[PDB]
Structures are given as structure tokens and as C-alpha cells.
Design a protein around this ligand. Structure first.
Ligand SMILES: [Ca+2]
Ligand SMILES: [Ca+2]
Ligand SMILES: [Ca+2]
Ligand SMILES: [Ca+2]
Ligand SMILES: [Mn+2]
Ligand SMILES: [Mn+2]
Ligand SMILES: [Mn+2]
Ligand SMILES: [Mn+2]
Lengths: 236, 236, 236, 236
């Protein structure tokens, strides 16, 4: 194993590691080389939204990221996550800056998980929403440079005096592990939404924000930085 | 006409109109001839469970039908429902018997609809669940022989002192119109669950149960008894 | 007669019918004469929030109303709504203006009701959420001057070209009847939230906004158009 | 020491420490001497259901525990719990047996927490349910003789060969901490439901099951066996 399924909001195109030659939105399955991508357009300074969906029966993993004004992108891949993921996982959001930098601010985050089966209702389920983040988020595993600011926002990557910083990595995970699958399960599904703010003084920006599902114990790998988005140790 | 999107639990093969020559489940888009079908075996006098899923980014409608033990069957179909469905709908369950008969008993019904936008705040959402039924469902629109018995179960087709009745048709729509898409719509989704109980003295049975989405004003069309499941005028 | 239980956001003190000599919130039971009120200070032009709660075990109906900043006011009244309401009801928001006028604008609304029994299977429940009102809400029964503006706001009372109008009443009820209690139920509970905007160029404003529960066929009673906030025929 | 709020399903009358001279249900504020108590008759061998509820405006913690008709016992106590509990807490279940014993089997558990210092699009929400417990629950902090059987039920007190043991303590806490209150808070609230099976072959039994919220690091106190329900070190 050692596993990651992520949805990447990729803000710098490294054509050498199979990024398309433009800012994009992608689906990652065990590799940084996105299994599917669509054209995205960052809009420096604006609050964006990301909606992610998967359903064990339809087996389509789809995401959509939107800025107000109608300008939005969708991508979906098409994969049986029962076979990829472990039964228990932790969900999270992570982000990185490179030589080029940006704010990777999360203003809000929601997530639903259902393990229904039979005789209906719910064998197991989880829901959390955060619309403000506590100064001391006791239900989040903060990793690397991930902090909450005095605004009740989650700064995945470092920010000094209104300014982003180079070579930063932050991840935040939901404290509780999530039972994404069981042998006796009929359906499994999850839905995740988060709002983000990517801003910088420069027009050149790096490297992106991603939402990820991983193993319970998962921590920031080794060559995680820049364009590995805190997710993978190599570009394979 | 009536614009019906339906998920059928078809208990009797009408091969003359494209039914596979076996009990099955189907995704129907504007026609009784399922746009997708999957073999399904009825367990007489047992409690089944059905789960229905749609997400407007995935654009795939899927459905699962399952009995305790393991027995289950899935079906899905790729369709942009935005292009099939009107801004406003009502949802419901329908059922019918022919010369051959069955109990078409609902023991529980759940529904979720989210019209999404640029945040974790849903533009519009609706969620109802019924785990037993009121003797006078003022929130249900009962059509045909649909009714609720002295147990709090919804009997869509008739029942006289135990035994089911022939040539019967029953529908129950939820009272509130459901907002299935706006303009400001970034994502629209819905999910539906119901537990059922199909029972007869005779081994050969007809005709089935269905979940449907229709124009709000929809009623049972003329001559849609038996093999048309109370959804369609003709078999075109 | 119309059976009404309401929570009032009374923006004008009519001391002649039992209003305290100040702007206040109140819990009304079968009467515009509030069973418990608390001092409330309207903030002109500011968006406020109210939260309403009840639970058949606790048998306390409480409300809280807050503006951004700090200012909040709560009121609470002990009552068994089993004895007061019909088994089936409808929930709405109503508003009125008198000689003096104000905008009674709703920007968001949501309602959970649960009927609980021997499970976590809610016996029955309903949940709807509005954050933007479509230009033509088929899920709302609009009465009196109530309509939806081109912003996706709900103007319970008339507003012409930015200016609110006098002698205006509006009500807006959710389409579906709510099952508020069943005899076989064990706990029955509801919660409501809505966000509002009272504005006016005059410092002197009237009359207020209400959230109410009522018999299903409840309509705006005759001559109920000012201090009676579209709820009551008279002042008893 | 541990800061503890609990609802006790007390199955043995310890009259030398303030228990009423019968079986009962009770509200515990930082002591096993319940602030309010109500008569409750344990029905041996039967799945009972318990619902707990609180809202920070009402300041009224109510509980209701019952069995298939009638036959239901209720207790409440007015209290500002947000001046009693730490900002962040953990929610859990605990049970104990003495010389006399019983099964304290949990079949289902659900919980909701809402912290709206907001305008409904919660600042912070958490919801979870289990209707079957996994044979290895990564998302429960198991603390006693508390394990989960092969039935998908949670045995809070030890059971050998279908038979309950003497002198057993067990507790299960949800993994994620819960943000019960913040300085910027307008309303907080919570609801829990669980279903339980108290069974024994001995005509006398002990000691009971409890729902509880305590500090995030709470663990089994030291004299907490038997009559102290795994909750308290002494009986003050
Ligand atoms: Ca990149
Ligand atoms: Ca057929
Ligand atoms: Ca008044
Ligand atoms: Ca005791
Ligand atoms: Mn990429
Ligand atoms: Mn068919
Ligand atoms: Mn008043
Ligand atoms: Mn006691």
C-alpha cells in the first residue's frame, strides 16, 4: 500500500512531471501524475469553493471548483475506491508553496461519510463542518506549517504580516478516523466541501491546495514540498 | 407530457416492450423501456432496501437493491439530468399489479436534495425521512389505491385481509415541490432510500415498485396500470 | 379560529395592547399578548439572526436574536405544545408595517423537525434550508404583499425602489405540512433559523417579523395588518 | 480532577449515597448524587432507547428513556452547562457491575453538536452515528472492559460465554474532541440517542449505564467501580 487519493487544485504547471501546460484541477490516485485533469483558472484574491463527491455504487469520483461569477471547472475519474483505500482512513487538506508563493487559506470545510448497508438508516456515519477555525483546533491534526490565524481561518501554509512565504508545507486532518468501508457494507459514500483563498502580490504563484484521503497514521512525506503538495515523496 | 425519471424494481418480464426476460431493476429516462437494466431476484416476503444516487458533476444516476444476507444488484446510467428535468419537481413512489399480484409495501422512505452554490451554505436543501407512516399522511399526496395501514406501512397497491389485489395502481408523492436546479446552481445532488416488502401466495407475481421524479403537477396517466407501473401513458 | 404559536421580533411598542415600552422579542401563545418578552434593540440596516428551539421533553420554547458585534437577546417560555397545536401544522414567517414602515427582508431560513421513537431511526422528520430564494418559490405558500426580489431575498412586506411601504402585510409558509407530534411518538422537536434585515430612513419603525407554527390552512386573518403582525384577528 | 456531566441509567439503589430507594434515571452534574432523579423500571432482556438533549438558550438538560409502549421515564434539570464544562470536551458511554451483574450492551449510538456563534451555516458542527459497531473501532477510545462483540454490538462490561461478569468497568469515548462552547458563541446545543440491552439471569442486578461529557483527556477514575458508574473517584 500507502495510499493517497486526493483532489488537487494545481496552481503551477510542472510539464516535466506530467502537469498540463496551464493551471489546472486534477484527480490523484496514488501518484502526483493526475489520473484526470481539467483546465482551471486561479483568480488571485477571491474566495473559491470546492465540492467533492464519490459514491461506491456509481464509482465516479468527481470534483468541481468554483469562483463566484459562474466561472467553474469540473473533473471526474472513474475508479473503485474500495480496492484502493483501506477500510479506515483520515481525511484532510494540505498545501505547499515553492520558490513562488501564495496564501493557501481555508475559510471553511465540510465532510460527510456514510456507511449504510441494509435495513436502511445508518450503520455508521460522520459529518463535520467548520465555518470558523478555533485558535486551538483540538479536533484537527495540524502538520507542518499549518496553523489557524486570528481571523478564524486555517492557514495551511505560512503567512507573515499579510505576506505568504516560500517553501512552506502544511496539512490538516480531521482528528477522528473514518470508516470508509466494511465487508458487510452495501453502499459507501463521502462528500467534501471547503472554501479557499489563494492570493499573492506576484502573478506567478505556486503550488496549490489539495483535499486528501489517506491511512490513519499518514504524515507529511519527505520530498513533499513545492509541487508534491505535501502528498507524495516522489513524482512517480 | 409528464416528464418521468424513474428507477424501477420490475418483478415481471414484459419482453414485448424491451423488458429483459427476467426480474430486474432499471433506470428509465422518459420511457418504460429502461435505458439500463440489471438482473435482480425478488425474495418473496422479505424486507429489501433500495438506494438511489445522483450528483450533477458526476452526471451518473445509479441505484442499488439489496436483501439481508448478501444478495444485491446495481445499475447506473450516465445522463445530464439538467437537460431532462424541469427546474421544479416532486418525488414519489409508485407500484402496480396486473392479473398477477404482489404486496407493494413501503416500510420506510428517505430523501435528500441539495442545490449547491459558492459555499458550504446550501442554496437550497430538503431532507425528509419516514420510518413509519402516519395513518393520515398530510405531507404525502396519495394517488390511486395508495394508502397507509394499521401498522404505519405504505400500501401502494391494495391489500384485503392479508392477500394483495389484481389490477391495482398506487403512487405517493411528497407534498413539497423539490428545487432540482437553479441558474446560480454549481452542483445539484439527490439521494433516496426505501425499504420494501413484496409478498404473494402465488410464485408468479407482477408488476413492481418504482421511485420517480416528475413535474410537480403529475398524476397517474391514463392506462398506465400493471406493466406500465403508473408512470407512462403508452409503452413507447 | 387560527391556532397560532409564534416568536415575534416586535419593532414598535404598542403599550395599549400589552407591549413593553421598548423594542422586544416575544413568545406568543394563541395571542398577540406575549407570554414572555425581553428587551431587544433593533439595529437599522444591519443583518440579524434568530434561533428558535423546542423539544417535547424539555417543554421549553426558547428564542435568541443576535446582530453581528455582540448584542443578543433571549426569551424562553415553559409550555407543552402537545396541548396547544394540532397534530399537523405549517411553519411560516410573517411581517407587517403600520403607519410607520420598515423593510422586513429575509435572506435565509431553515427548519428541522423530528419525531423520535425506539431507535435512531427518526420515526419521521423534515429538514429544509433556504439561503437564496428563487424568483418563484414553488415550495412556499406566499400570502399578502410577500414576494421574492431580484437578489434572491424574500420581502414579506412591500418595498418600492429601495423604499419600504406602509400598511403592508406578508406571510410565507413552507408548502409541506409538518407532523409536529404523533400519539405514538416519544420525543418531538423542532429548530428554526432565519436571517433578517430591518431598514428604514426613519428612526421610528414598525412593526416586526414573526416565525410561526399554525393549523395547516392558516391564512392571513381579517384586519391583522399592523401591531398584529399578520397573525391575529384581534388583540385578545 | 475530571469535570463530568452525565445521564445515569441507575439499576441498583445505593441509598447510603443519595440514591432514591428504587431503580431510576438521573442527571449528574460533577457528582454521583444526581441533581434530579426519576423513577425508572428496568425491563430485563429488552432493548431500551435513550434520548438526551440540551440547548444553551433553554439552559435545560432533559433525558428520556423508554421501551416499546408504554412505557417511558423522563428527567430534566435546569443548568447552564457552558459555565460548567470546558470549551472542548469528549462525549462517551460508561457502565459498571458490582457483586451483582448485568450486560450493558450498546446496540446503537448517535450524537450531534452544533456551535452556532454564527448565522446557520454553523461555525462548527459535528454529527456521528453507529447502528453496528465494528469489531475494531478506530474511532472509539475504548477504556474499560469495553470491547465490541461479534454481533456488532458494544459490550461496555465484560461478558463471558453469554454471561455478564462481576466487578467490571468500561467506557467508550468518541475519538474527535467536541467543541461545546466558544467565547464568540451565540447558541450551542447537543443531542444524543443510544439503544441498550440490560440482561441478566440473576433476579438482582447492577449497576447501570451512563452517557457523559467530560474533559478531553478523561479516563477511568480510581474508586469508580460498581456504584460510581466508572465516572467518579468518590461519592461527594
Ligand atoms: Ca504543480
Ligand atoms: Ca415489467
Ligand atoms: Ca408591537
Ligand atoms: Ca446506583
Ligand atoms: Mn497537477
Ligand atoms: Mn422493466
Ligand atoms: Mn409585543
Ligand atoms: Mn443514582
Amino acid at each position: 500500500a500507502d495510499t493517497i487519493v486526493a483532489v488537487e487544485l494545481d496552481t503551477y504547471p510542472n510539464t516535466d512531471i506530467g502537469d498540463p501546460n496551464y493551471q489546472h484541477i486534477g484527480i490523484n490516485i496514488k501518484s502526483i501524475r493526475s489520473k484526470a485533469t481539467t483546465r482551471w483558472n486561479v483568480q488571485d484574491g477571491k474566495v473559491g469553493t470546492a465540492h467533492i463527491s464519490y459514491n461506491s455504487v456509481a464509482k465516479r469520483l468527481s470534483a468541481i471548483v468554483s469562483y463566484p461569477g459562474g466561472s467553474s471547472a469540473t473533473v471526474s475519474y472513474d475508479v473503485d475506491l474500495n480496492n484502493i483505500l483501506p477500510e479506515w482512513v483520515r481525511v484532510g487538506l494540505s498545501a505547499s508553496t515553492g520558490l513562488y508563493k501564495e496564501t493557501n487559506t481555508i475559510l471553511s470545510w465540510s465532510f460527510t461519510s456514510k456507511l449504510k448497508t441494509n435495513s436502511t438508516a445508518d450503520a455508521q456515519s460522520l459529518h463535520f463542518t467548520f465555518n470558523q477555525f478555533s485558535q486551538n483546533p483540538k479536533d484537527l491534526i495540524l502538520q507542518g506549517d499549518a496553523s489557524t490565524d486570528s481571523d478564524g481561518n486555517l492557514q495551511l501554509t505560512r503567512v507573515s504580516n499579510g505576506s505568504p512565504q516560500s517553501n512552506s508545507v502544511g496539512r490538516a486532518l480531521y482528528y477522528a478516523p473514518v470508516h470508509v468501508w466494511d465487508k458487510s457494507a452495501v453502499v459507501a459514500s463521502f462528500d467534501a466541501t471547503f472554501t479557499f483563498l489563494i492570493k499573492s502580490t506576484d502573478s506567478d504563484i505556486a503550488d496549490g491546495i489539495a483535499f486528501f484521503i489517506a491511512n490513519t497514521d499518514s504524515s507529511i512525506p519527505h520530498g513533499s514540498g513545492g509541487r508534491l503538495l505535501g502528498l507524495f515523496p516522489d513524482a512517480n
